[PDB]
């Protein structure tokens, strides 16, 4: 268990998840495998709260769980949930999320231009360039939506597009430390 894997897990859990998730990972960092019941007592969290957090952790497959069934001293069957961290799956999931976010950024750049550029305030619905031509009446000599017959302003569509561009540089810069950690964990 190289410290690089632990550092990468701590960075991602403390960055893209709440304090509750980070605390659970800390226990599993100290000990490779820990019982679900023991974690609940150590954290003192609510049963539902811990279960919801554990389900979210399993959803991202950062930590795996195994079910052990044994007979207690009094004779009643005991089914304990043992949680252990699987770094091999954790890195793959982290890589999946990062590339998906990256492809989301590149696709989002094209999505900005795909947005409709015509908006009628009266109807309060988007209008595409193709639909705008159809709504135009040659007899009238001016372009208006047939349903409401109102002027259309394209200035509104421009504003949201500019915001996304700034997010590009910030997202790329803030994600560099995670990329550096991934390169260190390739071995």
């Amino acid at each position: 268990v190289p410290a690089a894997l632990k550092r990468l897990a701590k960075y991602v859990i403390r960055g893209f998840y709440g304090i509750e998730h980070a605390l659970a990972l800390d226990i599993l960092i100290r000990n490779s495998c820990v019982k679900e019941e023991d974690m609940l007592e150590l954290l003192k969290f609510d049963r539902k709260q811990l279960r919801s957090v554990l389900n979210n952790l399993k959803g991202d497959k950062f930590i795996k769980c195994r079910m052990r069934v044994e007979t207690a001293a009094d004779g009643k069957t005991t089914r304990h949930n043992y949680y252990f961290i699987n770094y091999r799956t954790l890195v793959n999931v982290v890589k999946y999320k990062l590339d998906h976010m990256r492809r989301r950024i590149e696709t989002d750049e094209r999505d900005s231009t795909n947005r409709a550029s015509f908006k009628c305030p009266v109807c309060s619905s988007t209008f595409t360039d193709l639909e705008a031509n159809q709504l135009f009446d040659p007899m009238t000599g001016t372009f208006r939506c047939t349903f409401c017959h109102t002027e259309v302003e394209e200035d509104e569509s421009a504003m949201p597009k500019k915001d996304a561009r700034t997010l590009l540089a910030r997202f790329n810069e803030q994600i560099e430390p995670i990329y550096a950690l991934l390169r260190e964990t390739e071995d």
């Binding site: 893209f16 605390l23 150590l42 890589k95 999320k97």
Partner: protein, 171 residues
Amino acid sequence: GYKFGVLAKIVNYMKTRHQRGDTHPLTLDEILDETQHLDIGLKQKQWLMTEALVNNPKIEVIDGKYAFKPKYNVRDKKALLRLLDQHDQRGLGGILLEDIEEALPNSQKAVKALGDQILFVNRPDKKKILFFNDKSCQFSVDEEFQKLWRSVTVDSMDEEKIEEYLKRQGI
């Protein structure tokens, strides 16, 4: 009945006496005098002297006599900060706000003075749980980033498709 109730009045009188500011220890007989327990039974006296006054976490045995335990209870901001740090370091867990308010009079001043150093978790019953603010590694993103992250569903995607995406994008 008998043998189990006189102790409660002793504890409550001891608690009230401490609130007055009397930190000096008090003998078993002396406390009995003000609690109208002069007729307390003999076997009750020994039981208090041996079990009740030592097992309880609010009784301190000082120079033979017994005194309150304000040191364990939080009574200043520094102890609250130190106490919370110890819980996080040992992973013991948080403490309900009620347990701190009762132990720390005017706990609002201490809570506000520490500010972000305390992490508050709101229970369904409005109860607040206090946790240490580990400032080792901190990272946050704009609400847009979190909203975009939530929009990207991952629970309903199988492992095969998740790993197949990696080779699909060439990484």
